[PDB]
Amino acid sequence: GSHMLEADLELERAADVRWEEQAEISGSSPILSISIKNEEEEQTLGLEDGAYRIKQKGILGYSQIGAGVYKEGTFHTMWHVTRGAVLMHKGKRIEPSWADVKKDLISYGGGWKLEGEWKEGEEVQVLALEPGKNPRAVQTKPGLFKTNTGTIGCVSLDFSPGTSGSPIVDKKGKVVGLYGNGVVTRSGAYVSAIANTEKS
């Protein structure tokens, strides 16, 4: 075969993972992105902790295919986003360490480090990194759903699909889960399943 990677997948730091008090008061609020970034330009590109965009290079420039969370040396994202492909961050290569297809989850440089928690009734913030947009924190109340084998919490699919991988956070600032894990419900709707929220 070839010794070059099939695709140029670059990470781009976008925001601190933390609970945003302004979004708790207003329902939503922008987050600072650094010099202050007034606008996000998807097509240009621009590891320690935070929320990252995942951008694929093509002839027309970069496309945001997803997002993810770096924590304690491990990058966390959605399986469907990278399909296990090797990632780059500023010339440093990151390799897949672990994956669960049914959860639509994958991590790079270690196992799952996400420790956010959620119990029915509590509110979370999606720290949305959408294609073309500065980071925005949006308060939401997850609903509880039955599996199949137990329970999961879920949020509504209210962001661009390229937002997949974006951290959803609790009041402690810990990541309960990632946006974009589309599952089908009993009554015909699709929602975003959180996990860590999973019990069985």
**DSSP result, 119-169:** -TT--EEEEE--TTS--EEEEE-PEEEE-SSSEEEEE---S-GGGTT-EEE
**Overall number of domains in the chain:** 1
Set 107, 164, 166, 192: catalytic member = 164
Considering only CA atoms, give the Rg of the chain: 16
Residues ending a continuous segment of the chain before a break (C–N > 2.5 Å): 34, 46
Contact status, residue 170 vs residue 118, Cβ threshold 8 Å: yes
Set 33, 76, 104, 107: catalytic member = 104
| 164 catalytically annotated | yes
Neighbours of 99 (CB within 10 A): 15
Q: Which are the contacts of 146, defined by CB distance < 8 A and separation ≥ 6?
A: none
| 80 catalytically annotated | yes
Domain residues for the domain of 8 are 1-200
| 33 catalytically annotated | no
Rounded Cα–Cα distance for residues 195 and 171 (Å)? 17
Instruction: Compute the Cα dihedral for 57, 61, 66, 69 and give only its sign.
Output: positive
SS3 state at 22: helix
We report the CATH number of the domain holding residue 11 as 2.40.10.120
Closest by Cα among 137, 103, 145, 138 to 120: 145
